Amino acid sequence: PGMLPWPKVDFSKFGEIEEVELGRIQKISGANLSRNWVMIPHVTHFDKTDITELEAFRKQQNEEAAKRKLDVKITPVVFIMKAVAAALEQMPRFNSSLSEDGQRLTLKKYINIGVAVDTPNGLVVPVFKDVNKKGIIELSRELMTISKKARDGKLTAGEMQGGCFTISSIGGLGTTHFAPIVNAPEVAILGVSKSAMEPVWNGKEFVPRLMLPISLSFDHRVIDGADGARFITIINNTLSDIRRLVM
Amino acid sequence: PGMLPWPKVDFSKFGEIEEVELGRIQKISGANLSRNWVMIPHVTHFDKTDITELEAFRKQQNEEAAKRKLDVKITPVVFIMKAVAAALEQMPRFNSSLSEDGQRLTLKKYINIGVAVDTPNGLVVPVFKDVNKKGIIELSRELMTISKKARDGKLTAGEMQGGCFTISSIGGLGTTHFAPIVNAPEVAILGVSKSAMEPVWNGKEFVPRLMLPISLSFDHRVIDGADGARFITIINNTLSDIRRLVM
Amino acid sequence: PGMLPWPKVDFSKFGEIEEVELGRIQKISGANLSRNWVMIPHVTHFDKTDITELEAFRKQQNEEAAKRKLDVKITPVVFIMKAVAAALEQMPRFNSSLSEDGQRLTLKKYINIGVAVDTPNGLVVPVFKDVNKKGIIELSRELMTISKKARDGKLTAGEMQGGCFTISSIGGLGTTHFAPIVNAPEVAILGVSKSAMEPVWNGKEFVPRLMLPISLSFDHRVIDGADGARFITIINNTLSDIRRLVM
Amino acid sequence: EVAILGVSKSAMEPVWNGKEFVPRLMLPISLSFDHRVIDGADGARFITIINNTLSDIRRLVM
């Protein structure tokens, strides 16, 4: 366009500097993020789900499977993936991709979910196939195997494609809320922060509930505010009462 | 520019797909949103107003007008519109529009407010003229008539123009906070989520207050952070103590 | 590109209007903000720090220095600057600048911090040099002198250059959260809202703590979500327990 | 003029709310009017409207 150029200031006049290059993966990620930011309008919706029975049941399952000797660890991100898959089942519009020209929408019938995994080189997004037709134990085992593979830096190109709903979990570091960036060709992305014990009004007095904040960014060209609010409310209801996964 | 092209991935290799076209209104809305996102820098400010006397007085007015037989329903969005009109009266800068070249600012003396109305085809923004010179009952009656007209899909082009401050209310669906997108030629936009009973510190101990979260997006080219903070604080004060509407 | 043009609507057909020009500084600021918005993807992270001992110790220092007669006022923004400098010391990546082509990163060894100061013409960002090698009293005195100079409108060009981490404080106006815009060539920017007495769970029951909300915007091309979360968590820990400034 | 309103001194009086008396700052208001044009019912309605507006000032916008 006709914008001003990037400010070029000689940083060596204020102190010592050290100019270094960037890796190929970093450059590709930066270019993709810039393109997504300049091509996708983001409308982040924030919410807080009540996760008290889910965490207790997860710890109960872990302590009851330790006795049975299974070497399987169950994480809340598995339940988040299940809730996301259920919400995608209920609303097929979020499980789609907008074309380059923005005139044709390619709806998807399958549900494959990407998961943000921390690595010494940054973050990776391995994709799990068919999350709506798998159990908690199988998903946990696959997640453990994929995390072990990623932390060793051996992920292949076939496990990095086919995603439909990236989930970014950063609850182990901090933050109470953050707005992620939708990555093409996906339409929506869900971010999870750290869970905190907050007072919640039940009707008579406040009670301590383990609230988990969830943010949801989406492309405003395909999804409006009402649909995003309904989608995040469905996710909130599924996470607060996991028993809805069978109902 | 020189960005990477949109990722083209054959989605048919992972499962069944169904490609469908988009309507003219959807395409126009998407193009407008994309242009606004790539031309308007958004600086969303979040706040929570204390609405306990306002809701109680609204229900009191409804129950006292049911006896008088008026067939008029009073909604909190009417009070939100009145507060927005008062804030626009106090600060004329938000009631304006920036030119295409970004060098000339067209200040406005009139106050017409757009309202987000849910329809089976999405969201519409009918505009109410002269909100600063109308009463609560008249505004409620006009809002009911406009909502009935919109839900029937009979809105005309003359009722979709002249707005100065779009208000997006999604409290009936969910979300605790969301950042809307400013639509040209408007400068600011206000989003309203769902009201929740939260503990508020009065000076001695926490008390349950019905807090309503409000977000405010605006163009950073014309409005800076301080002016936006003052504007949203004025709205917060007007909504928390509605008696300021006459003072 | 091929976006739709800016909507041109004759505003004189709805009421009185008054078209006015914009100042040179306003135009330059708007152009810079537009360029930063269209070139830098923003990923805002929100957090709330527990500031109860820091505020009490600040008021204690003020009341104990009033007796000694020093004519020095201590503000929490000084402690925020110290925490930011410590975090930049711990993580040199945030104290850098990305080149125009996005392939070379110029790391910085010095720490100069910009501060948002309110003026009748808007907001200014004077830069303080070497914040990691100065005391609280010296920083407070320099801040008072700079604020007095700025409110008189006598800031020079030499005091407006060399910054590495702009801090925007708007706690004296309102808002519970806001997402600022990163200004080139800086990588990250921190925004501070108003502190509120909120209930915090300690392990047995909620206690009133003076929580201060802090937002952090950064360029996603250089900083990912995990690094930003770690950085804001380090700032949160430094602000909640200021005694870490020596440890 | 047809009517005239007189205002005296406000006093803290006990008012029954439904369960027990509470102290409320009551203000006495008198209203004289010409009986040729205004009857008792219209004057009572007018003074009741004034009473409702003064007791709940938020009605000034409603």
Side-chain angles (χ1 to χ4, degrees):
Chain A
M3 58 178 177
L4 298 181
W6 184 270
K8 300 178 300 300
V9 181
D10 198 333
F11 311 105
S12 180
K13 270 66 180 180
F14 304 96
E16 297 290 340
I17 59 178
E18 181 179 2
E19 183 172 348
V20 78
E21 297 290 339
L22 300 179
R24 309 303 179 272
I25 47 180
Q26 300 180 0
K27 294 180 180 179
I28 266 63
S29 61
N32 295 332
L33 290 168
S34 303
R35 167 249 299 165
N36 296 329
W37 183 258
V38 304
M39 291 185 60
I40 296 181
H42 297 77
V43 184
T44 308
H45 282 51
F46 300 91
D47 199 329
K48 286 184 176 178
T49 177
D50 190 1
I51 301 190
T52 61
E53 62 174 20
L54 178 59
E55 192 74 12
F57 194 77
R58 182 191 64 89
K59 84 177 186 299
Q60 168 186 349
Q61 289 298 139
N62 288 126
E63 70 179 4
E64 291 178 0
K67 300 174 59 181
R68 291 186 174 92
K69 186 61 180 301
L70 300 179
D71 197 69
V72 178
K73 298 236 61 179
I74 303 180
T75 49
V77 63
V78 183
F79 306 103
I80 298 179
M81 292 171 59
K82 293 246 64 181
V84 166
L88 292 179
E89 281 181 330
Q90 186 167 354
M91 291 185 174
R93 188 173 180 87
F94 280 82
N95 183 22
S96 61
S97 295
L98 186 62
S99 60
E100 181 179 1
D101 60 330
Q103 300 179 0
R104 303 169 293 100
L105 181 60
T106 304
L107 299 178
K108 302 177 181 180
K109 306 304 178 181
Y110 58 95
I111 298 185
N112 309 333
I113 293 181
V115 177
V117 178
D118 189 9
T119 57
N121 300 270
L123 299 179
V124 296
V125 192
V127 176
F128 296 90
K129 310 299 183 302
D130 299 0
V131 199
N132 59 332
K133 299 179 181 301
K134 291 183 178 181
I136 291 295
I137 302 299
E138 179 182 4
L139 282 181
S140 301
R141 188 179 307 175
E142 293 181 3
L143 174 67
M144 291 181 60
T145 302
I146 289 298
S147 298
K148 233 303 178 181
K149 189 177 185 179
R151 280 180 277 97
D152 300 1
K154 300 180 180 180
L155 291 182
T156 61
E159 303 176 0
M160 209 69 60
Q161 298 180 359
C164 303
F165 203 102
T166 303
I167 300 179
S168 180
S169 181
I170 54 177
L173 302 178
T175 69
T176 62
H177 263 153
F178 83 105
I181 293 185
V182 184
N183 55 89
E186 302 181 5
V187 176
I189 181 180
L190 185 77
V192 180
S193 300
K194 60 181 178 180
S195 59
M197 187 69 63
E198 306 178 10
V200 179
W201 177 267
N202 54 19
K204 302 180 182 302
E205 63 179 4
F206 303 105
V207 291
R209 309 298 292 180
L210 189 64
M211 306 295 300
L212 181 67
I214 48 178
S215 61
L216 171 67
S217 302
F218 52 86
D219 187 6
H220 206 1
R221 302 175 299 181
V222 188
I223 304 299
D224 60 328
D227 286 337
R230 295 187 185 96
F231 186 83
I232 195 170
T233 305
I234 291 172
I235 289 189
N236 164 87
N237 293 329
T238 307
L239 289 176
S240 55
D241 304 323
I242 205 65
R243 304 196 285 261
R244 297 175 176 264
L245 280 184
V246 291
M247 315 300 167
Chain B
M3 58 178 177
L4 298 181
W6 184 270
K8 300 178 300 300
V9 181
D10 198 333
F11 311 105
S12 180
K13 270 66 180 180
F14 304 96
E16 297 290 340
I17 59 178
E18 181 179 2
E19 183 172 348
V20 78
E21 297 290 339
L22 300 179
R24 309 303 179 272
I25 47 180
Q26 300 180 0
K27 294 180 180 179
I28 266 63
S29 61
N32 295 332
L33 290 168
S34 303
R35 167 249 299 165
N36 296 329
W37 183 258
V38 304
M39 291 185 60
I40 296 181
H42 297 77
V43 184
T44 308
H45 282 51
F46 300 91
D47 199 329
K48 286 184 176 178
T49 177
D50 190 1
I51 301 190
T52 61
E53 62 174 20
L54 178 59
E55 192 74 12
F57 194 77
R58 182 191 64 89
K59 84 177 186 299
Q60 168 186 349
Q61 289 298 139
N62 288 126
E63 70 179 4
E64 291 178 0
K67 300 174 59 181
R68 291 186 174 92
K69 186 61 180 301
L70 300 179
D71 197 69
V72 178
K73 298 236 61 179
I74 303 180
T75 49
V77 63
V78 183
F79 306 103
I80 298 179
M81 292 171 59
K82 293 246 64 181
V84 166
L88 292 179
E89 281 181 330
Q90 186 167 354
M91 291 185 174
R93 188 173 180 87
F94 280 82
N95 183 22
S96 61
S97 295
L98 186 62
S99 60
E100 181 179 1
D101 60 330
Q103 300 179 0
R104 303 169 293 100
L105 181 60
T106 304
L107 299 178
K108 302 177 181 180
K109 306 304 178 181
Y110 58 95
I111 298 185
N112 309 333
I113 293 181
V115 177
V117 178
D118 189 9
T119 57
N121 300 270
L123 299 179
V124 296
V125 192
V127 176
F128 296 90
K129 310 299 183 302
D130 299 0
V131 199
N132 59 332
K133 299 179 181 301
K134 291 183 178 181
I136 291 295
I137 302 299
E138 179 182 4
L139 282 181
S140 301
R141 188 179 307 175
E142 293 181 3
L143 174 67
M144 291 181 60
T145 302
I146 289 298
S147 298
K148 233 303 178 181
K149 189 177 185 180
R151 280 180 277 97
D152 300 1
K154 300 180 180 180
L155 291 182
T156 61
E159 303 176 0
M160 209 69 60
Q161 298 180 359
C164 303
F165 203 102
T166 303
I167 300 179
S168 180
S169 181
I170 54 177
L173 302 178
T175 69
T176 62
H177 263 153
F178 83 105
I181 293 185
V182 184
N183 55 89
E186 302 181 5
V187 176
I189 181 180
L190 185 77
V192 180
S193 300
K194 60 181 178 180
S195 59
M197 187 69 63
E198 306 178 10
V200 179
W201 177 267
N202 54 19
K204 302 180 182 302
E205 63 179 4
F206 303 105
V207 291
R209 309 298 292 180
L210 189 64
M211 306 295 300
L212 181 67
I214 48 178
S215 61
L216 171 67
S217 302
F218 52 86
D219 187 6
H220 206 1
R221 302 175 299 181
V222 188
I223 304 299
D224 60 328
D227 286 337
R230 295 187 185 96
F231 186 83
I232 195 170
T233 305
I234 291 172
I235 289 189
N236 164 87
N237 293 329
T238 307
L239 289 176
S240 55
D241 304 323
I242 205 65
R243 304 196 285 261
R244 297 175 176 264
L245 280 184
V246 291
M247 315 300 167
Chain C
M3 58 178 177
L4 298 181
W6 184 270
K8 300 178 300 300
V9 181
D10 198 333
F11 311 105
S12 180
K13 270 66 180 180
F14 304 96
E16 297 290 340
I17 59 178
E18 181 179 2
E19 183 172 348
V20 78
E21 297 290 339
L22 300 179
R24 309 303 179 272
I25 47 180
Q26 300 180 0
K27 294 180 180 179
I28 266 63
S29 61
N32 295 332
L33 290 168
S34 303
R35 167 249 299 165
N36 296 329
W37 183 258
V38 304
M39 291 185 60
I40 296 181
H42 297 77
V43 184
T44 308
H45 282 51
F46 300 91
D47 199 329
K48 286 184 176 178
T49 177
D50 190 1
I51 301 190
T52 61
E53 62 174 20
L54 178 59
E55 192 74 12
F57 194 77
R58 182 191 64 89
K59 84 177 186 299
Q60 168 186 349
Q61 289 298 139
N62 288 126
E63 70 179 4
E64 291 178 0
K67 300 174 59 181
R68 291 186 174 92
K69 186 61 180 301
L70 300 179
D71 197 69
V72 178
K73 298 236 61 179
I74 303 180
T75 49
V77 63
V78 183
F79 306 103
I80 298 179
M81 292 171 59
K82 293 246 64 181
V84 166
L88 292 179
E89 281 181 330
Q90 186 167 354
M91 291 185 174
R93 188 173 180 87
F94 280 82
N95 183 22
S96 61
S97 295
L98 186 62
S99 60
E100 181 179 1
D101 60 330
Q103 300 179 0
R104 303 169 293 100
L105 181 60
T106 304
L107 299 178
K108 302 177 181 180
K109 306 304 178 181
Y110 58 95
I111 298 185
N112 309 333
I113 293 181
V115 177
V117 178
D118 189 9
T119 57
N121 300 270
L123 299 179
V124 296
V125 192
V127 176
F128 296 90
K129 310 299 183 302
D130 299 0
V131 199
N132 59 332
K133 299 179 181 301
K134 291 183 178 181
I136 291 295
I137 302 299
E138 179 182 4
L139 282 181
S140 301
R141 188 179 307 175
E142 293 181 3
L143 174 67
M144 291 181 60
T145 302
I146 289 298
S147 298
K148 233 303 178 181
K149 189 177 185 179
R151 280 180 277 97
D152 300 1
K154 300 180 180 180
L155 291 182
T156 61
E159 303 176 0
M160 209 69 60
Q161 298 180 359
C164 303
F165 203 102
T166 303
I167 300 179
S168 180
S169 181
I170 54 177
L173 302 178
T175 69
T176 62
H177 263 153
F178 83 105
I181 293 185
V182 184
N183 55 89
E186 302 181 5
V187 176
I189 181 180
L190 185 77
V192 180
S193 300
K194 60 181 178 180
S195 59
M197 187 69 63
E198 306 178 10
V200 179
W201 177 267
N202 54 19
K204 302 180 182 302
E205 63 179 4
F206 303 105
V207 291
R209 309 298 292 180
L210 189 64
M211 306 295 300
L212 181 67
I214 48 178
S215 61
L216 171 67
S217 302
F218 52 86
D219 187 6
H220 206 1
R221 302 175 299 181
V222 188
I223 304 299
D224 60 328
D227 286 337
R230 295 187 185 96
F231 186 83
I232 195 170
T233 305
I234 291 172
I235 289 189
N236 164 87
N237 293 329
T238 307
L239 289 176
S240 55
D241 304 323
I242 205 65
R243 304 196 285 261
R244 297 175 176 264
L245 280 184
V246 291
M247 315 300 167
Chain D
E1 302 181 5
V2 176
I4 181 180
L5 185 77
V7 180
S8 300
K9 60 181 178 180
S10 59
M12 187 69 63
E13 306 178 10
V15 179
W16 177 267
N17 54 19
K19 302 180 182 302
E20 63 179 4
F21 303 105
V22 291
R24 309 298 292 180
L25 189 64
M26 306 295 300
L27 181 67
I29 48 178
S30 61
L31 171 67
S32 302
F33 52 86
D34 187 6
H35 206 1
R36 302 175 299 181
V37 188
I38 304 299
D39 60 328
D42 286 337
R45 295 187 185 96
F46 186 83
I47 195 170
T48 305
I49 291 172
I50 289 189
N51 164 87
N52 293 329
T53 307
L54 289 176
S55 55
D56 304 323
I57 205 65
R58 304 196 285 261
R59 297 175 176 264
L60 280 184
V61 291
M62 315 300 167

